[PDB]
Amino acid sequence: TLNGGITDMLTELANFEKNVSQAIHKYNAYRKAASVIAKYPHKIKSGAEAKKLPGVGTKIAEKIDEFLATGKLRKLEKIRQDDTSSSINFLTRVSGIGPSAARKFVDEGIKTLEDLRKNEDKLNHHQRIGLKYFGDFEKRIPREEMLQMQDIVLNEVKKVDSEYIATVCGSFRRGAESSGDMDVLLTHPSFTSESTKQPKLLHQVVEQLQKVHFITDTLSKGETKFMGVCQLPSKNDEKEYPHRRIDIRLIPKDQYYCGVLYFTGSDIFNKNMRAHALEKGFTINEYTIRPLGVTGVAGEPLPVDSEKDIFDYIQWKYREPKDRSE
DNA sequence: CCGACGTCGCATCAGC
DNA sequence: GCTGATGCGA
DNA sequence: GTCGG
Numbered sequence: 254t255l256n257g258g259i260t261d262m263l264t265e266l267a268n269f270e271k272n273v274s275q276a277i278h279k280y281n282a283y284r285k286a287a288s289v290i291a292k293y294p295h296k297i298k299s300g301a302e303a304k305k306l307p308g309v310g311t312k313i314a315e316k317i318d319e320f321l322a323t324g325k326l327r328k329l330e331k332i333r334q335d336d337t338s339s340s341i342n343f344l345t346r347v348s349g350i351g352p353s354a355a356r357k358f359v360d361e362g363i364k365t366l367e368d369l370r371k372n373e374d375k376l377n378h379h380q381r382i383g384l385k386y387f388g389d390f391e392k393r394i395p396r397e398e399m400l401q402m403q404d405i406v407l408n409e410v411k412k413v414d415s416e417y418i419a420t421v422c423g424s425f426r427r428g429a430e431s432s433g434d435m436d437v438l439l440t441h442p443s444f445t446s447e448s449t450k451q452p453k454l455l456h457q458v459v460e461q462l463q464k465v466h467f468i469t470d471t472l473s474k475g476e477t478k479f480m481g482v483c484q485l486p487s488k489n490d491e492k493e494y495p496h497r498r499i500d501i502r503l504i505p506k507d508q509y510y511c512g513v514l515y516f517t518g519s520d521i522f523n524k525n526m527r528a529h530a531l532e533k534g535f536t537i538n539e540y541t542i543r544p545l546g547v548t549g550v551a552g553e554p555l556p557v558d559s560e561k562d563i564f565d566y567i568q569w570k571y572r573e574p575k576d577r578s579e
Numbered sequence: 580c581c582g583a584c585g586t587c588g589c590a591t592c593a594g595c
Numbered sequence: 596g597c598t599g600a601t602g603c604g605a
Numbered sequence: 606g607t608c609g610g
């Protein structure tokens with residue numbers, strides 16, 4: 254209502270720049286421009302007013318002038334009508350098809366899901382699974398579902414080994430009523446840096462979840478990370494729950510809790526905590542915490558074993574995930 | 580002017 | 596066959 | 606595209 258019309262404009266140009274022009278840097282720029290505006294409690298009456306905000310320059314200021322004066326963006330309308338560009342942006346929506354594949358497909362005449370089904374012998378394992386759950390992937394995951402899903406993973410991860418620590422991070426940790434992705438992090442005492450690579454640990458857990466029919470498909474799998482699809486048990490009378498995305502990541506006990514807080518969020522929280530860490534003399538790198546020197550030479554990573562453990566370094570108190578928004 | 584805007588493990592591909 | 600670049604996803 | 610050395 255306020256600046257929703259402008260934000261929608263910037264977000265469209267953002268996706269265009271990512272999928273069509275393949276300019277991730279201009280994509281992030283347009284995305285950042287829409288962010289600061291979405292936090293502005295006032296109706297932007299002119300581009301000059303918007304340029305004041307960090308992330309908005311002259312180009313975006315001029316665009317707003319046209320959007321308010323004419324009622325839309327002239328350059329944006331040409332993009333929408335352009336069959337070639339509008340189709341490329343669509344194909345990328347499919348998990349597996351990126352900005353490169355989408356273009357290669359359109360050149361061959363493949364532009365829709367219907368056209369994809371015909372030429373399925375041209376899609377790899379990932380691209381096929383994506384097409385299969387095209388809609389199920391674009392749907393949001395309610396907290397209640399996340400809770401039910403969590404119990405299963407926790408029950409199965411402990412049922413296979415009591416020394417397994419698994420915590421679902423992300424928006425879920427912050428108490429979000431939604432999620433859209435099930436990011437799980439796990440560790441074991443038998444895995445601590447110096448310890449040799451463990452292709453048995455992650456594989457062990459994955460097999461157990463597939464054993465109870467939770468994990469349906471697999472996008473990619475290795476010795477440390479896992480990416481696939483999952484689904485809750487079919488309910489009586491009612492229709493079965495949609496297929497959801499799930500990522501499992503094995504992390505050492507030395508980088509576990511340090512890696513937990515990072516994936517716990519938020520995106521703004523990481524920035525504020527990264528800057529404050531440097532103010533005291535420490536530097537965060539997702540994995541460990543290093544005490545830099547007078548010239549900035551990071552030293553030997555100091556021991557970490559908990560969530561508050563890291564706060565007991567930068568003179569900060571334990572801030573609850575429900576408040577780690579900013 | 581003009582270069583920096585995170586990352587990185589896994590699957591597919593190129594070249595040798 | 597092995598090595599190394601490129602594409603993809605959060 | 607937007608910022609800052």
Ligand SMILES: Nc1ncnc2c1ncn2[C@H]1C[C@H](O)[C@@H](COP(=O)(O)O)O1
Pocket residue numbers: 423424434516518519520585605
């Ligand atoms: N450019 C860049 N650098 C570093 N981290 C980034 C960047 N862009 C996004 N993110 C992080 C911020 C969130 O923790 C996560 C997305 O959360 P999700 O719930 O998966 O949408 O990705």
Ligand code: NA
Pocket residue numbers: 303304305306307308309310
């Ligand atoms: Na600005």
Ligand code: NA
Pocket residue numbers: 344345346347348349350351
């Ligand atoms: Na895609």
